[PDB]
Structure formats: structure tokens, C-alpha cells
């Protein structure tokens, strides 16, 4: 007590969700003409890395991208000329995430050392330097993104999300409603709220200004591994190890599409959306990512790479290209 | 020709490429080891016998070899994750106890964890060195109160090399995969001989690999 009150509240909220609407997204959109098969080919081959890579990010203007490797090196690639703008050596070899700020001044990177530090790219000395080392968490970092020029949001294995501040160098907020290891987060196009996953098959939406979650969707089976919004910010479709991709609506507050295929039984490492919100890319294991139609929920052309094994993929702001990175130290640009 | 500044940019790119390749070839000669244990293991003994809230890295030189030892004890998350980060590791080191068998049992859980980590998907072609710590400690414990164990059907002799040999054979079991050898050694944590056996194990692993290329194996 009052555990029975909690379970009856869960039952009544489930009944309300069931009775909210009669929509099923199956009788509708079936008559809408689907898009044809989509074919992609490799257009660039970034072969400057030497070991496993985990995550990468696209900078603003869709020409510069950043990637991280187990060799403890950050490379600021150039999409067009395939030259390397910078080569930042890191203090800690183990790295699990790297993010590029909206302005090219700063870049964040972190890993198992419980710290995702900041590096400056524009200075009089003309060389990269340590800007700030931020140590607030205890568990391993997952991903810290930039919400402003001097404000970042972190995700650590200690089941906390903090939303650090650069100049002060101290935590200004904390989120502790997951009760499970977080894995990814993606800020919405609007800069007042975001969402983050957890290892207990639950995704929770947090408010930037306020301190508590709002919805706490729990409509998944096994785990959560990647979350990413699409414009207008109402889907943040996610994938997991259960070979299932699902998208949730904040207002609907109920499962909508729950993509699934019987042939494939694998995991998911990263998920991204397109510019128009029609095609969503998801990198599976088995070493070959896939593309899925947002509306018709059918399957399009399989992708070739990589050798071993696809781990991250990102889509530029203009959508002119997609970057994919795999453990074989190969970054490929596909159009 | 393409332009003026782009030629300089390409030259800088080649220069940093050469620097990166040199750094990588320099860093590819060292050997890395992963130390994993359990509750009340010999972490302190191994750390002190080498000669903040995160993973500890210890690098030391012994006979023209730069050993890089990584131990993960401060992490509180599930070991099923982040374990793939150490896929490319030369060898791992395990410590058991001996004489932990009737306390919050200990050897049963340690053996279960060892079997679980020895039979996972992507971590198979990696050698495991296993240490028999507290060698002098369990003699009096087995002498005073034999034997027993809560692990039944032992049906063997009493003291004392027999029990150690039986435990070593039991731990050497569960190696379903072929072409993978598990090394065992017992230390009193008194003298300084662990470095020598680690070096011998490492050179044996290196020989088994190169020999592998001709394969041939």
C-alpha cells in the first residue's frame, strides 16, 4: 500500500489511452501511393581512422563533420574535398560520444572516463586546446549535445541528466526519473524540451526550464538504443536491440507504428530522420543499415556497407548527404 | 590544377596523415591486458605487486614490454554493455577466492560469472589467465573445518594440494570453444613472481598467434 493504488492508476490510464481514439494507422494511409524503391551508392571514402569508431555528428552548413575513435583522436572531416581540418588528440583513449556545436567554435567529446570535455576550434594560437573538463557524473557518459553556445546536456550511466553550464562549470539541473541506464538523447528543433531513453525499455521527455518529466512513455519491449526527432518534433522514433523501430507522439501518448520485420532478428545502433520526414535510416547489426518509409511502413532498398560493423549514421541539415560510420574505421558519404 | 590554397590544404592534410600514421604505428607495438574480478578479490594485491570514480589505467615497463593494464571496478552499470570496447585485447586476468566459499556462495557466483564471460558472443578468441589468490590462507581453513563443501559430490581426498588441483581442473572446464587456453597459477601474495608468469603467458600468447599466421597452426 498504496501499491494497489499505483497499479489501478496504471490500469485506468491504460483504459483512457485505449478509449482516446479509434485510429489504428492501418486502414488509413493504405490507399496513399507509396514511394518507389530507393537506391544509394558510395560517393566518398574516409579512410583516415585506425581503430573502432562509435559516434559521429554533422556540423552546421552540411560540409564539416566530426567523428571519434578508440584511438583517442577527433578528426574534423571535410565532406567535399575529403581533407582533415583538425586532428585533436584526447587525454582518454576510450570515447563513447562526440557532438558538434551549432557554431564551429566548440566541440564536445567524452567516453568511459565519466567526463565529456569541451574543445575550442577558434583561437589566436591556431591550435586545438582543452577548453573545459566537466566532471559531475559517476556512471559512464552516453551522449552530450549542445543546446546553445555555452550550454550542453549530458547523459550518463548513473541514470541522471544534468544540463551542464559552461562558464559556471557546475550542474544547474538534475533528472532522476529513469531508474535505469540511459543510452541516447536528441534535443527537439525547439530548444525548450527534449527526450531521452533508458535501459528499462522506457523513454522519458524532459523540460529544459523545469525539473521533472511529463509523459514517460513505456511502450517498448526490451531496451532503447537511439532516439532522434524529425522536424515539427513529434515522433522521436526510436530503435532497440529487439529489432523493433517505434515512434511515439507527445499528444497521442500511445504507440503508433511499431515497425517490425520477421526476416531480420538483430539489434539497432543508431536512428536518424530525413529533412522532409519521409525516410528514416536505422543502422542494424548484421553489418547493413536500412531505410524505412515513415508513413507506409514498408521496406526500401538495403544498403551495402559496412565490413564490420555499422555503428552510427547522421543526416545533414539540408539532407544532401548521409554519413555512416562503422567499427572498420571507415566513414562513408552516401547520396 | 585546381587552386592555390587548396594545394596547401592538401599538403597539410598529408602531413597530419603521416603524423597520425606514425603515432598509430608507435602505439600498435604495446600490449594491453584487462583485469576483471569479483567481490573481495585480490585487486589490492595485484595493484601493489605491479613491480577519480572511473577506470584506472596502469602502464609499466618490464623487459622491453610496455604493459597497459585496465581494471574496471568503479563502474556500477551492467557489464553486458561497454564490454565490446575491450574486444581487441591481448588477454584478461581473473582472480578468485579461495577461501571464499561460505560467505556472502562466493566461489559459486565467481565461477558462474567466469563461465558467463567465457561464453559470450564476440569475446571468445581471448586468453584468460586465472590466479589462485590467498594460497597460504586457505590451508588453515581447510585443515580446521573440512571440507566440505556446500558444493556437493566432491567425494575426494582431504588436504591439501588435492583440493587446489580439483578446483583448478573445475575452473579449467567449461571451455567449450577450441584453440583457447586458460592459464592457472597460485600466489601467496608474499614474494615477487607474478610478473614473470604474466610475461611467460604473454609471450606464449604472442607465439600462438604468429604461429597462427602460417596456420600452420
Amino acid at each position: 500500500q498504496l501499491r494497489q493504488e499505483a497499479e489501478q492508476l496504471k490500469n485506468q490510464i491504460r483504459d483512457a489511452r485505449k478509449a482516446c481514439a479509434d485510429a489504428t494507422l492501418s486502414q488509413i494511409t493504405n490507399n496513399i501511393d507509396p514511394v518507389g524503391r530507393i537506391q544509394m551508392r558510395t560517393r566518398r571514402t574516409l579512410r583516415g581512422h585506425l581503430a573502432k569508431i562509435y559516434a559521429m555528428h554533422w556540423g552546421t552548413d552540411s560540409r564539416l563533420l566530426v567523428s571519434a575513435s578508440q584511438d583517442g583522436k577527433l578528426i574534423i572531416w571535410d565532406s567535399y574535398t575529403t581533407n582533415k581540418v583538425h586532428a585533436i588528440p584526447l587525454r582518454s583513449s576510450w570515447v563513447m560520444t562526440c557532438a558538434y556545436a551549432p557554431s564551429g567554435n566548440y566541440v564536445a567529446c567524452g567516453g568511459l572516463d565519466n567526463i565529456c570535455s569541451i574543445y575550442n576550434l577558434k583561437t589566436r594560437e591556431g591550435n586545438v586546446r582543452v577548453s573545459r573538463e566537466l566532471a559531475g557524473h559517476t556512471g559512464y557518459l552516453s551522449c552530450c549535445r549542445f543546446l546553445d553556445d555555452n550550454q550542453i546536456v549530458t547523459s550518463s550511466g548513473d541514470t541522471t541528466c544534468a544540463l551542464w553550464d559552461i562558464e559556471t562549470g557546475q550542474q544547474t539541473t538534475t533528472f532522476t526519473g529513469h531508474t535505469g541506464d540511459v543510452m541516447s538523447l536528441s534535443l527537439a528543433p525547439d530548444t525548450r524540451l527534449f527526450v531521452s531513453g533508458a535501459c528499462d525499455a522506457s523513454a522519458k521527455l524532459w523540460d529544459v526550464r523545469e525539473g521533472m518529466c511529463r509523459q514517460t512513455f513505456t511502450g517498448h519491449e526490451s531496451d532503447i538504443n537511439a532516439i532522434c526527432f524529425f522536424p515539427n518534433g513529434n515522433a522521436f522514433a526510436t530503435g532497440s536491440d529487439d529489432a523493433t523501430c517505434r515512434l511515439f507522439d507527445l499528444r497521442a501518448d500511445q504507440e503508433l507504428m511499431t515497425y517490425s520485420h520477421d526476416n531480420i532478428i538483430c539489434g539497432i545502433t543508431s536512428v536518424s530522420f530525413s529533412k522532409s520526414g519521409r525516410l528514416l535510416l536505422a543502422g542494424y547489426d548484421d553489418f547493413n543499415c536500412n531505410v524505412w518509409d515513415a508513413l507506409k511502413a514498408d521496406r526500401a532498398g538495403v544498403l551495402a556497407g559496412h565490413d564490420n560493423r555499422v555503428s552510427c549514421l547522421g543526416v545533414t541539415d539540408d539532407g544532401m548527404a548521409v554519413a555512416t560510420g562503422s567499427w572498420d574505421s571507415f566513414l562513408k558519404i552516401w547520396n | 590544377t585546381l587552386s592555390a590554397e587548396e594545394r596547401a590544404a592538401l599538403e597539410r592534410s598529408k602531413a597530419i596523415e603521416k603524423n597520425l600514421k606514425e603515432d598509430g604505428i608507435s602505439a600498435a607495438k604495446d600490449v594491453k591486458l584487462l583485469l576483471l574480478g569479483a567481490g573481495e578479490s585480490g585487486k589490492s594485491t595485484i595493484v601493489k605487486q605491479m613491480k577519480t570514480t572511473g577506470i584506472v589505467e596502469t602502464h609499466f615497463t618490464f623487459k622491453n614490454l610496455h604493459f597497459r593494464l585496465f581494471d574496471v571496478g568503479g563502474q556500477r552499470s551492467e557489464r553486458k554493455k561497454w564490454i565490446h570496447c575491450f574486444e581487441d585485447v591481448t588477454a584478461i586476468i581473473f582472480c578468485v577466492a579461495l577461501s571464499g566459499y561460505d560467505q556472502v556462495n562466493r566461489m559459486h557466483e565467481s565461477l558462474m560469472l567466469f563461465d558467463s564471460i567465457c561464453n559470450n558472443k564476440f569475446f571468445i578468441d581471448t586468453s584468460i589467465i586465472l590466479f589462485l589468490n590467498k594460497k597460504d590462507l586457505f590451508g588453515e581453513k581447510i585443515k580446521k573445518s573440512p571440507l566440505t563443501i556446500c558444493f556437493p559430490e566432491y567425494t575426494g581426498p582431504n588436504t591439501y594440494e588435492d583440493a587446489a588441483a580439483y578446483i583448478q581442473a573445475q575452473f579449467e572446464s567449461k571451455n567449450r570453444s577450441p584453440n583457447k587456453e586458460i592459464y592457472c597459477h597460485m600466489t601467496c601474495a608474499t614474494d615477487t613472481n607474478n610478473i614473470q608468469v604474466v610475461f611467460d603467458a604473454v609471450t606464449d600468447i604472442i607465439i600462438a598467434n604468429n604461429l597462427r599466421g602460417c596456420g600452420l597452426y
Partner: single-chain antibody
Framework: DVQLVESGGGLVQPGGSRKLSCSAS????????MHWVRQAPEKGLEWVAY????????YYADTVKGRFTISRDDPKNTLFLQMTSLRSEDTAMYYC??????????????WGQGTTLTVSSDIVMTQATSSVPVTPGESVSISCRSS???????????LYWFLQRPGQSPQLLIY???NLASGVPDRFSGSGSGTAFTLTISRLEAEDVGVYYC?????????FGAGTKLELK
């Protein structure tokens, strides 16, 4: 902070030898490329030599090749230049300039303090008129004409601008004739087609009175034009 210091000037008999050396301490000298700039005793500017960051690429001017040599010593953060068989026309005052080349760079941003040495086809640019009567608080525009179109197929226009205060080392204003260098007020602005280039200065005040220079970086050799100076009528 960044600061370039050199001291190699003096009275030299014609047909002599001399060494010029400039030292950098305010940044990473090993990762930058050095330029040498000559300033005629009255108004002129002329390019001399360039050495890359890796010292694997060397260029020279038409009137400089075969007489002068350039080198740099990376551990000591120093640049060396050799004057050999110098002639009467070589009397001038010299600059050594830092430059880095990558995407979104600002080369020729910082210029050092010069030293004076006394004695005893190619793209051309034109400016006019060298004398413009202007008053503070009124907008002014300065244009310079180039021979060949600067619009490369990459969508970039390799043109740079410089301002020289009376009695002080020149500093960069605009790079690639479309961006704005750091430490420059927003009042400055410059634009043009692939051939003609013109600034757009708004709310001019009583300190931006130095002579203006426009330079081309499309291909070697780099050439400067005859600048135009303002006044306080």
C-alpha cells in the same frame, strides 16, 4: 600574446650580404606558413617569398628568384632570410607574416613590426583615385579594378584587403572579400563581381584614415596594387 620581432636592418654597401631574422613566440610556429612582404620607401608594396608549414613548398618572385633564400627553424620558432648581391632598388622595409591554409581560415591576419634596410603573365590591379576628400560621419566606398576574373569554379573569390595606419604595421580587414575578420567593427563591408571589387564603409570616423590595399590570392605570384589614402578635409 602574439607578437613578431625582427632586427636585421642597417646600412649595407651595394653588392653585399645580410641576414634577416624574425621570431614568433605568441603561437605555434611549427604549424604555420611564413610570408615575406616588401614595402617601398615611399608607398609601394611587393611580395617577396613564401614558405609552407612543412617546408616542402617554396615560391619566389620574378625579381627575387636566384638571389634570396628563405628558411625557418621550427624548434627555435625563427624565420631566416638571406640578402645576397642586393642592388640599389632593393632598399625597403620588410615584414614577415603568419598564414594558415585550411577551410574557413583567416590567412595574413597578423603582421609584425618592420625593419628598414638601406643601400648605397601576372595579375595586375589598379586603384583610383589616391586622394579622396572625406569627412567624419559620412559613408565612403573604395574600389579597385583587377585584370582577370577572380571567380573560381568553387564559388570562392580569392581577394584580401588591408589597412595601413600612418606609422604602424598594416592589418587585415576583409578576407575572401565576403567575410569579416575578427576584431573589425561591423561598419566595414566589401563586395563585387568576379572582376570589380568595392568596399562599403558606413559612419566613417577619425581613426580609419590609413591607406587601403587590395590583394589577389588566385595564383602565384601574389601581387599588390597602388593604394589610396584618405584625408580630413
Amino acid at each position: 600574446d602574439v607578437q613578431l620581432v625582427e632586427s636585421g636592418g642597417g646600412l649595407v654597401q651595394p653588392g653585399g650580404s645580410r641576414k634577416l631574422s624574425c621570431s614568433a613566440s605568441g603561437f605555434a610556429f611549427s604549424s604555420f606558413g611564413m610570408h615575406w612582404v616588401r614595402q617601398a620607401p615611399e608607398k609601394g608594396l611587393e611580395w617577396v617569398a613564401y614558405i609552407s608549414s612543412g617546408s616542402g613548398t617554396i615560391y619566389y618572385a620574378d625579381t627575387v628568384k636566384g638571389r634570396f633564400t628563405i628558411s625557418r627553424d621550427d624548434p627555435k620558432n625563427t624565420l631566416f632570410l638571406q640578402m645576397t648581391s642586393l642592388r640599389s632598388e632593393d632598399t625597403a622595409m620588410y615584414y614577415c607574416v603568419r598564414s594558415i591554409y585550411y577551410y574557413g581560415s583567416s590567412p595574413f591576419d597578423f603582421w609584425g613590426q618592420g625593419t628598414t634596410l638601406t643601400v648605397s603573365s601576372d595579375i595586375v590591379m589598379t586603384q583610383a583615385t589616391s586622394s579622396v576628400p572625406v569627412t567624419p560621419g559620412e559613408s565612403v566606398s573604395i574600389s579597385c579594378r583587377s585584370s582577370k576574373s577572380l571567380l573560381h569554379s568553387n564559388g570562392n573569390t580569392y581577394l584580401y584587403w588591408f589597412l595601413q595606419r600612418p606609422g604602424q604595421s598594416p592589418q587585415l580587414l576583409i578576407y575572401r572579400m565576403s567575410n569579416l575578420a575578427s576584431g573589425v567593427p561591423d561598419r566595414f563591408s566589401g563586395s563585387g563581381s568576379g572582376t570589380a571589387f568595392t568596399l562599403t564603409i558606413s559612419r566613417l570616423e577619425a581613426e580609419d584614415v590609413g591607406v587601403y590595399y587590395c590583394m589577389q590570392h588566385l595564383e602565384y605570384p601574389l601581387t599588390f596594387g597602388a593604394g589610396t589614402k584618405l584625408e580630413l578635409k
